[PDB]
């Protein structure tokens, strides 16, 4: 069952990479918006929003890994 | 063969971390320069540059997973 | 109980640590941006930058070290077989 488990890891690498890519675009955006704003109350909402968004993304990736792990177990029998 | 496929997976994980590491120094550089500058046109150019550089890095990592996908196929048969 | 199933969990453990690294770095980056908006003294800001940089390097090196473990542990599993 070597090819199946291998395909699984390739899938995983893609998930984590996409998460990494989405977090990067989030950080470029947080820096861009912060440079644009002067009001600190307003800047704090952008930061608070990026933070929870980042948290959603990390959690999504965490569940994907958990699912890849469970699927490995079944393929293991 | 299993050992070769695992070697492939270790290689891939390392390259994904390398992309993560390069993005982080990029993000750190972007914040540093933005704190240094006041002119927004110049700041937007720093932001634009870091962004395209981030995509290049992201695109290379995507190609690497793709290579790893091809290579795994060849080895399993 | 396969050698392959054990190699597989090694990779699962490996993806987690790297994600954990990415998560930690992401929080370092947001904190640095937060403090940057809060401060006007450049000396202070540059110190916060140096701190995040050193912290980010350690996290990356911690992850590089775990990869070296996975690689070595994987080798060990090679002769070990069903």
């Amino acid at each position: 069952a070597v090819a199946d488990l291998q395909r699984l890891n390739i899938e995983l690498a893609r998930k984590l990479l996409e998460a990494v890519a989405r977090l990067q675009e989030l950080n470029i955006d947080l820096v861009r918006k912060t440079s644009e704003l002067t009001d600190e109350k307003t800047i704090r909402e952008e930061i608070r929003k990026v933070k929870e968004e980042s948290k959603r993304i990390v959690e999504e990736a965490e569940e994907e890994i958990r699912r890849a792990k469970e699927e490995s177990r079944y393929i293991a029998d």
Side-chain angles (χ1 to χ4, degrees), chain A residues 25-64:
Chain A
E25 293 301 326
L26 278 185
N27 287 332
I28 287 158
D29 287 343
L30 181 60
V31 168
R32 176 188 296 105
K33 300 207 206 78
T34 297
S35 84
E36 281 156 3
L37 315 164
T38 54
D39 192 347
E40 188 62 20
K41 165 188 173 74
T42 303
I43 286 152
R44 284 194 194 290
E45 326 197 330
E46 296 293 338
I47 284 157
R48 196 56 170 69
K49 190 198 59 184
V50 164
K51 175 157 169 188
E52 294 303 290
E53 279 172 326
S54 294
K55 177 209 54 195
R56 295 208 294 272
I57 296 183
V58 162
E59 262 148 6
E60 293 177 6
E62 248 157 4
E63 309 205 300
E64 280 156 346

